[PDB]
Structure formats: structure tokens, C-alpha cells
Amino acid sequence: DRELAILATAENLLEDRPLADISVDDLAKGAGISRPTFYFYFPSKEAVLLTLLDRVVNQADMALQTLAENPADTDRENMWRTGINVFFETFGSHKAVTRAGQAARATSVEVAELWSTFMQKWIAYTAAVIDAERDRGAAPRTLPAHELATALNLMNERTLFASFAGEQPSVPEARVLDTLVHIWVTSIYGE
């Protein structure tokens, strides 16, 4: 409630400036509570970012679970597009949290461990699906599935986040999805 108000205030301020330029007072003021009352709900501004990232990451994760149980009925190219799109839409809707979350990996053990855990989970799932495609005779046994999954997942992380941040260089946001699907599909189904 006042917890939601701190989270919403943090997301809003992270649209105009970095975490280093937001005080606890900036978050308290924003949620319409005192500094001490803020500290009842969170030990630090760093813990606020950690909670926002955790919510975004879990939304993407739950969305990928929903997709896995209920596969789209279409060509394998569009199936994978649907999969990459969970990440494009979810993080695309939380650019400020995403950008700051990734910055905070350099400086926060918990942010690095949180991201690391979900990346291992998304790679393990990518690799399971690639091996399935190999078992049903649809993809050739080229690279170790788990190595291929790791590199594709690291590509998406870097490429999605460069696009969202408008970095130079980057693929424009409106071309990035098709860019990643081409490389996933060719690298998974070619020899």
C-alpha cells in the first residue's frame, strides 16, 4: 500500500535520473511518508531497486511459464518469436527498472545473484527446448544445446538492453525482435 507507493515513486524517478541521483528523502516525499516511515518498509534505496527488478524478472518468468504450458499453434519461427517477445514486452515496459537493475549488477551482490539465477533458468529452458527439437528430428545436433542457449541468451540481454537504452551502437527498438528471431532460428535449425 505505502509499500506500492514507494515502488511506484522509485520507478517514476528512475525515468528521469539514475539511482545515485535519488535520495531516500526523494522516495519518502514521493510516496507522501516521512524518511523514518520509509525505513520501516525498506532498509535502503538499493533494496527498492532490488524489489522492482525482482517483480519485473518474476513477471517475465511467469509469462514464459504460461507460454511453455500453452504453446502457440504456428511455425517454429513464430513460436520462438512469441518466446523472445515475453522479454521484449516485459522489460520494454519497465525500461527504467531494467536499465538501473543492469547498472546495479556491478555494485550489488543481490542484484547480480538475482539476475544470474534467472539467466541460468532461462538458458536451461532454452536448451531443453533445443534438445526436444533435436529429439523430434526438427533441428540438427550441431553445438552443445546448453552452450548455444547461453550465447543466444547473452546476445538477447545485451541487444535488448542496448536498444531500450538507445545506445550507440544498437538495433532500433522496432527492428530488434525480428533481428533476434532470425539469429535464433538460423543458429538453431542450420548446420
Place this chain on the structure above:
Amino acid sequence: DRELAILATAENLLEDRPLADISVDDLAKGAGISRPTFYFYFPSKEAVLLTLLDRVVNQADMALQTLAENPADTDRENMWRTGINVFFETFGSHKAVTRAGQAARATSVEVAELWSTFMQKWIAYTAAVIDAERDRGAAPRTLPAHELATALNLMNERTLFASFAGEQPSVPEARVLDTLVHIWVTSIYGE
């Protein structure tokens, strides 16, 4: 001379700890000069990292120029392997400078601009070679060459550096080259 001694001292200390844990006195002591004498050669420890990164980046760049003028006489798979390998060997030999250089992108305008400039140059060259391969009828016109180049280059950056840092997750250093060549070759020559 005493300039080289500061650079060598910085590279050495960046093997055991981050830049934030190295003082100017740590670099002066190391090069066997006073603090004031250090400041004659460099305005800050941050400028030392910038000079090391600039040297590594220019070595990779000059090595890729040498390759471009003197192409290996082999299959296209091995040609590209030779190309990715400039980056694998060059940065692979300067892991500590590479790791710290990438950290310093978040916190230094000059490090971000230096890296940004060379990435645009390496993407422009990748894209020129892809278009050549399209013109000589060897690769299909799939994705815009420059978008494909950008994503592949961002993949290599993230994947090479995760491997070098031993991050979880990452491809092991001894499997990363073959991993990237498979994805480059399939994504450049498949449809």
C-alpha cells in the same frame, strides 16, 4: 618509459583488484615514482585505465585491419573464425584491462565514447563483408546486413566478456570461439 612503468603497474594491480581499490599512490609506488611525478604523466587513475583500454582496442583494430588486407585462404567458416579470434586472443590476453574498461563505461564518458566508436567501426566492417558475400552470391539477402552485424557484435562483446570474467552463466573460455563461429556462420549463410 616511466609512462610505460605506470601502465604496466596499473595492468598488474588490475589483476588482483578493481580500479576503486587502487590509489594513485598504489600506482606511483608501483612505478617507483612520487605521487606528484605520477600526476606529470596522468591527470587521474581513471586516465590510466583509459590509456590501457585505448592501447588494447587499437591492437585489436590494427590486427583486424591486417587480416582484412591479407585474408586467410580457407573455407568461409575458418575465415570468420580467424576474424572473431583477433578479439578472443587480443582481449583474452588483457582480461583485467578489458573487465575494468567495461565496468568504467557506466562511470566514464571517455571510456563509453572510445568503446562506442570502435564498436561502430567493427559493425560497419562486419556489415561491408556480409554485403560482399551477398554481392558474390555466397550469402542470401535475409536481414539488413547492418542490423545483423550490430547484434552479432553485441553478442560477441557480452559472450567474450562473460567467459573472460568466469561469470555465471557463461560459455567456458575453451568453447566460446566455436560457439560464436557456429552462430555467425549459420545466421550469415542460412535463410
